Write a protein that binds this ligand. Structure first.
Ligand SMILES: Nc1ncnc2c1ncn2[C@@H]1O[C@H](COP(=O)(O)OP(=O)(O)O)[C@@H](O)[C@H]1O
Ligand SMILES: Nc1ncnc2c1ncn2[C@@H]1O[C@H](COP(=O)(O)OP(=O)(O)O)[C@@H](O)[C@H]1O
Ligand SMILES: [Mg+2]
Lengths: 617, 306, 356
């Protein structure tokens, strides 16, 4: 049950908030919940109302482009007209959800509309109908809210005229003891699978909470704009450990610690940008394991020493590096034979990244974002891993003279292929594929919700429902109401559609807004391709130059400093060529004042190809 | 000269990719640090290396000069850095747009002008790649991503014929097809996807090029006979080396065997040609210090000009 | 004698310069033909495996599949020879004639007409008429006759490219890359039924033929008089989803002296049995007696059972890399002697044979 997202662990804070929230709802007062993006305001909110026998839930998600038509449609599905508006339930008072109230945008003259409509509904106790010009009386409908503080770049400050009538609450981050208890319950539930290690529930909960605490304390938002850690990351770590254990072999303590370290590597440190930051994370992992688990026989737990794959067997188990590299090379040769041919070279970093992308893609509702310089092998890797898992590539061919219309058609066709035809698709989106912010808002609607209701309206909605009924009857399921068909359709979309984003230059304003979006940053897994480190470039050069003979001159070994040689210690002339090329590339990028901008290594590959051609001639 | 080639290949290959979008001063500085770095790692290079004299032969140099390219060495090595790209699509960036005529002269009637702002662009483009005609594109600052497969050369070898996917349909390509991109905006924003896959070559004119052109005008007007003598001696040295090689080929073909007057005459001609080579080299040895003195004497004019 | 199982170790070893793609058996004398990736065609003897009997270059590109048939012509003028047809990636297939006296190859004819690479070839004989079938990446299952050398029927069974075919009577089954199968009527070209249920492209498909006498087989014996008169009972398929599935053939709207028509209510396959346990893609299958043998990309070959439905024997680490092809002798035809050997080939430029 840890896979399903409607569960809580009752600690003191959540029951206290539920009690005060019942008091505030029963006091005929509007409620506004304001807190950090990871405090689980929506989680505790749905826990409070869903278990209640006195109130009901209606689902509205605000966007930048949102009008009162959505609110009217949502209330029409649960209320009735007698001029007085009353809910369908005669005992439970309807409670109207409104998350991300800061997200609707100001008009041309510095004001918002939906917040004023909500204010008129909650303090004038009604509104005026637009086409019939009639007053509306509302008796037992309450309003709730969940919005972030306006300090983050993208939240619009709200007028005091609306916050006047609604109570305000702050949901702080749960403390160490509460998180420890919650994740103790999580790990007891997750270790019911392997009873041989039931006694290790407490040290793992302590280790996860402590490691999250230090990873939050060290890497702040000053260094990077995407270091927004939250307990959501710990919950996703729990989900990853479950999806690894449930599909794994017979389990030992050493392999348990290695699995937990691999999950921590692939969920906390995949977004780190600096080599020294990664070394600090490695030292933190060492000291955490040493402090809370006095266990020996634990080997290297770096990124290149923890390789867990499902491709090499029927289960999620650790695999040898050499066998993995050979299997990847042969499968990739077959891929180039069957698909587009590209002279890609195999190295350890690309194996690590292809396995982490494979781990991301196998998850249900799994989406990830790739941040790295151009010509670093991102879209080709995504297509390769999608071909490995039997996915379907739907690459949106968007040209300059494009608009929202063709993008809407390609999204609609992808959704129809995913749902009606029952074919899994791995949608790829490049940085240049988002022209205006409207496509970004469409992506927000697609990912924050399970679908885009705007793409299906009127006759499109009717034919979509008819096709859904035809598919349901073809499968042989007794579904007749529109709610069940719609929920099954969005379940199929959430289960059989994965979006993977390709971002080239994160320092751009469009990229900054794209990675600053709240409905996109939290759900996706952030992966930093970055630029190649020296070892990867050395491996690529050694694998690319050896095809042509270099040894025809007597060479003397030059005595130089250890830090000046990036290849393994030099004994031939090929290593001299590798060192000279890497040194020139580093000096050139340093003397062009690129700054902290990612350094695209395509110059290096082009130089190597020109080198081998010219030396052959 | 063979314990030296691998240093001379790496300085030339690295000249092709990294030095596309740098001007004279940065090129000089980076070439100096490359030579020092090669010296640090003990790989022998040519102390008298010149990129044009290493890759641009006199025939192709004259063929490029007659097409319309200016006589400046920077434009010569940039024409070399463009035309020697067999794998990566090159990018041409000249505000003057002067070398569309040059590439039209080089490719003759095969040069077909296209522009990203055209509406029938895609149809004539797929036609041109079908017949394999050389294609010239204008207004690259408004790059259309529909040619993403052509830019990265993501073809597939379907059978014995190579194939690319343009637009929404399969099209065929031919081996004689080459593509060029010309732009007129030096500060025009370019997508990083296009920039990282092309050879960004800057055909611009800075203050350093002002100094170089002032020095060129001073040499070609103040003492023009000595520069003419340099050009004449370079041409005759190349011709004499070619004639010496032809005479040696004649001597080796005169082995016969299924001495005679023809073989002795060939040997005497080879002797005369080798003596001419030695005399030309001895005369040219005391001619480059005149260039050194002229460079050291015509630098204040460049400094004042800049 | 039909229940022979190869032992735990290979009988002999064979070295090739390049990776092995197809290994067949001479149905009368102990000669093994080994394919390559560089297009070279080899010829090895089981008792003398150090030096090849013959080596020949007939294709510019890689060869993918092979087939070997021994003719049974009723006239004494047309002697019984060996025909070897190799399909390659050079848009062309080549047909060889083996000679016993000189022990050397001889190209007879080459069949053209494919728009892309050809992946499989099968050879069969109904009544004194040799036909050659092949399927290619252009989705065209083409049929040739040996004497005329001309195409007889070109058709598409699947939108995506077909990979492997098998022939039996006037009915051809064909795997494809769209994770589905479809039987076709050989003379007319009408698709009798379409199979679905795999989650990955199909690698190899062959028919399951009948047997004369056996104690109890639940997957080769006829079921009803209709199937007894038809002459086919089950078909087996293998696909890259790490499984092997044996399928029934649905009934058509069959009529006497007329082309069969598909059944609108019974034109869909039914998955009968599935086998799991292979660590990677299953690459090739071969059926003999009551034992189903299949290779995979897990450096291993497995021996399954038709009746009980599990692996009796496993052979881990048979090669350094992927295991590419297996082949046996035909047991359902009385002309071919079902003698006891097994031959396998790997991607690590090695081949192995199983004797006794
Ligand atoms: N008291 C708690 N008990 C169980 N899980 C919690 C608790 N507090 C936070 N979480 C976890 O934190 C995550 C917060 O996610 P979410 O509800 O989307 O945050 P927000 O509501 O701020 O958008 C949830 O996935 C939830 O599992
Ligand atoms: N070792 C390598 N790793 C990654 N990319 C490489 C390598 N060698 C060459 N390339 C080039 O990178 C290109 C693929 O990168 P791609 O994923 O398309 O980058 P982007 O995601 O920025 O578009 C290929 O065309 C190939 O020529
Ligand atoms: Mg939130």
């Amino acid at each position: 049950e840890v896979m399903r997202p409607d569960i809580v662990i009752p600690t003191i804070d959540t029951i206290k908030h539920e009690k005060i929230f019942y008091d505030l709802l029963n006091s005929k007062r509007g409620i506004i919940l304001c807190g950090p993006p990871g405090s689980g305001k929506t989680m505790i909110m749905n826990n409070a109302l869903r278990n209640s026998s006195l109130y009901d839930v209606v689902g509205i998600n605000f966007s930048k482009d949102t009008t009162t038509e959505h609110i009217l449609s949502a209330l029409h599905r649960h209320t009735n007209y007698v001029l007085t508006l009353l809910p369908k339930s005669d005992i439970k008072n309807l409670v109207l959800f409104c998350d991300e109230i800061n997200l609707p945008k100001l008009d041309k003259y510095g004001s918002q509309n939906v917040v004023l409509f909500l204010r008129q509904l909650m303090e004038k106790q009604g509104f005026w109908k637009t086409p019939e010009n009639k007053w509306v009386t509302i008796e037992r409908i309450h309003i709730v809210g969940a919005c972030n503080p306006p300090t983050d770049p993208g939240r619009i400050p709200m007028s005091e005229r609306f916050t006047r009538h609604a109570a305000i609450l702050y949901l702080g981050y749960p403390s160490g003891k509460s998180l420890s208890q919650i994740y103790e319950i999580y790990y007891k539930a997750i270790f019911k699978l392997v009873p041989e290690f039931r006694s290790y529930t407490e040290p793992f909960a302590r280790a996860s909470v402590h490691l999250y605490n230090e990873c939050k304390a060290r890497y702040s938002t000053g260094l990077q704009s995407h270091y927004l850690f939250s307990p959501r990351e710990l919950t996703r770590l729990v989900r990853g450990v479950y999806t690894a254990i449930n599909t794994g072999p017979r389990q030992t303590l050493r392999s348990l610690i290695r699995l937990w370290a691999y999950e921590a590597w692939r969920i906390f440190a995949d977004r780190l940008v600096g080599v020294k930051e990664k070394n600090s994370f490695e030292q933190l992992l060492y000291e955490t394991v040493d402090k809370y688990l006095p266990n020996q026989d634990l080997g290297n737990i770096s990124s290149t020493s923890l390789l867990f794959s499902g491709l090499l067997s029927l289960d999620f188990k650790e695999v040898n590096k050499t066998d993995l590299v050979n299997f990847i090379e042969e499968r990739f040769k077959t891929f180039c034979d069957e698909e587009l041919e590209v002279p890609m070279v195999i190295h350890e970093s690309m194996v690590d990244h292809i396995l982490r992308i494979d781990r991301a893609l196998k998850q249900v509702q799994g989406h990830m974002m790739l941040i790295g310089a151009s010509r670093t092998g991102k879209t080709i890797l995504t297509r390769f891993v999608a071909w490995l898992n039997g996915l379907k590539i739907v690459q949106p061919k968007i040209h300059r003279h494009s608009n929202l219309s063709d993008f809407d058609m390609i999204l609609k066709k992808a959704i129809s292929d995913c749902s009606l035809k029952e074919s899994r698709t791995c949608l790829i989106i490049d940085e240049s594929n988002i022209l205006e912010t409207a496509f970004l808002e469409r992506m927000n609607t697609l990912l924050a919700n399970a679908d885009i209701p705007d793409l299906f309206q009127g006759e499109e909605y009717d034919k979509l429902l008819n096709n859904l009924r035809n598919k349901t009857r073809s499968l042989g399921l007794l579904l007749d109401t529109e709610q069940e068909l719609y929920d099954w359709f969005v379940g199929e979309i959430a289960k059989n559609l994965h979006v993977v984003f390709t971002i080239c230059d994160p320092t751009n304003n469009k990229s900054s807004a794209m990675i600053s979006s709240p409905a996109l940053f939290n759900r996706c897994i952030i992966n930093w391709m970055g630029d190649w480190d020296t070892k990867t470039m050395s491996q690529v050069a050694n694998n690319m130059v050896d095809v042509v003979p270099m040894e025809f001159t007597d060479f003397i070994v030059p005595e130089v400093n250890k830090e000046l040689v990036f290849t393994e210690p030099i004994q031939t002339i090929r290593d001299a060529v590798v060192n000279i090329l890497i040194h020139f590339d580093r000096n050139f990028y340093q003397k062009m004042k690129v700054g902290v901008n990612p350094r695209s290594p395509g110059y290096f590959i082009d130089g190597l190809r020109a080198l081998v051609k010219l030396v052959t001639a | 000269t063979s314990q030296e080639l691998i240093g001379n290949c790496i300085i030339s290959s690295i000249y092709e990719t990294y030095f596309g979008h740098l001007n004279e001063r940065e090129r000089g500085d980076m070439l100096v640090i490359l030579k020092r770095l090669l010296g640090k790692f003990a790989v022998k290079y040519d102390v008298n290396y010149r990129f044009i004299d290493y890759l641009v032969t006199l025939d192709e140099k004259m063929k490029w000069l007659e097409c319309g390219l200016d006589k400046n060495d920077y434009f010569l090595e940039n024409m070399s850095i463009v035309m020697n790209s067999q794998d990566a699509v090159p990018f041409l960036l000249d505000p003057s747009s002067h070398m569309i005529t040059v590439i039209s002269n080089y490719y003759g009637n095969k040069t077909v002008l296209l522009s990203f702002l055209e509406e029938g662009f895609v149809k004539r483009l797929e036609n041109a790649v079908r017949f394999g005609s050389v294609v010239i594109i204008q207004d690259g600052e408004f790059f259309d991503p529909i040619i993403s497969r052509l830019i990265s050369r993501e073809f597939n070898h379907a059978g014995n014929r190579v194939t690319v996917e343009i637009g929404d349909h399969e099209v065929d390509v031919s081996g004689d097809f080459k593509l060029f991109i010309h732009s007129c905006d030096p500060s025009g924003d370019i997508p990083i996807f296009l920039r990282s896959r092309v050879r960004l070559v800057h055909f611009v004119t800075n203050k350093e090029s002002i100094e170089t052109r002032i020095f060129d005008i001073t040499l070609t007007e103040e003492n023009a006979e000595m520069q003419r003598k340099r050009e004449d001696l370079i041409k005759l040295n190349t011709e004499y080396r070619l004639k010496l090689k032809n005479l040696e080929k004649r001597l080796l073909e005169e082995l016969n065997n299924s001495e005679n007057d023809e073989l002795m005459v060939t040997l005497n001609n080879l002797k005369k040609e080798a003596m001419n080579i030695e005399k030309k080299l001895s005369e040219s040895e005391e001619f480059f210090p005149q260039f050194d003195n002229l460079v050291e004497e015509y630098s204040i004019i460049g400094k004042h000009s800049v | 004698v039909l229940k022979w199982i190869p032992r735990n170790l290979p009988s002999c070893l064979i070295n090739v310069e390049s990776s092995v793609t197809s290994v067949k058996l001479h149905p009368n004398l102990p000669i093994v033909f080994v394919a390559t990736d560089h297009g070279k065609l080899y010829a090895f003897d089981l008792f003398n495996y150090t030096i090849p009997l013959a080596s020949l270059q007939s294709h510019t590109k890689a060869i993918t599949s092979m087939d070997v048939l021994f003719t049974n012509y009723t006239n004494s003028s047309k002697k019984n020879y060996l025909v070897i047809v190799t399909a390659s990636k050079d848009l062309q297939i080549h047909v060889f004639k083996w000679v016993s006296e000189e022990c050397k190859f001889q190209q007879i004819r080459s069949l053209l007409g494919h728009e892309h690479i050809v992946s499989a070839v099968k050879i069969w004989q109904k009544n004194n008429d040799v036909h050659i079938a092949s399927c290619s990446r252009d989705q065209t299952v083409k049929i040739w006759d040996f004497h005329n050398g001309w195409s007889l029927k070109t058709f598409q069974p699947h939108s995506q490219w077909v990979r492997s075919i098998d022939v039996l009577g006037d009915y051809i089954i064909s795997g494809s890359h769209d994770t589905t199968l479809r039987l076709t009527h050989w003379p007319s070209g009408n698709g009798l039924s379409v199979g679905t249920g795999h989650e990955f492209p199909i690698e190899k498909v062959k028919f399951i033929h009948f047997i004369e006498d056996s104690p109890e087989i639940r997957f080769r014996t006829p079921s009803t008089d209709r199937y007894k008169n038809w002459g086919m009972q089950y078909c087996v398929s293998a696909s890259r989803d790490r499984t092997i599935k044996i399928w029934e053939i649905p009934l058509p709207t069959l009529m006497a002296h007329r082309a069969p028509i598909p059944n609108p209510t019974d034109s869909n396959f039914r998955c009968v049995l599935t086998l799991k346990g292979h660590l990677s893609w299953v690459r090739d299958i071969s059926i003999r007696g009551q034992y189903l043998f299949s290779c995979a990309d897990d450096k291993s070959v497995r021996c399954w059972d038709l009746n009980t439905g599990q692996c009796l024997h496993v052979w881990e680490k048979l090669h350094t890399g992927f295991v590419n092809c297996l082949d046996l002798d035909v047991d359902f035809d009385s002309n071919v002697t079902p003698r006891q050997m097994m031959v396998t080939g790997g991607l690590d430029c090695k081949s192995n044979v199983f004797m006794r």
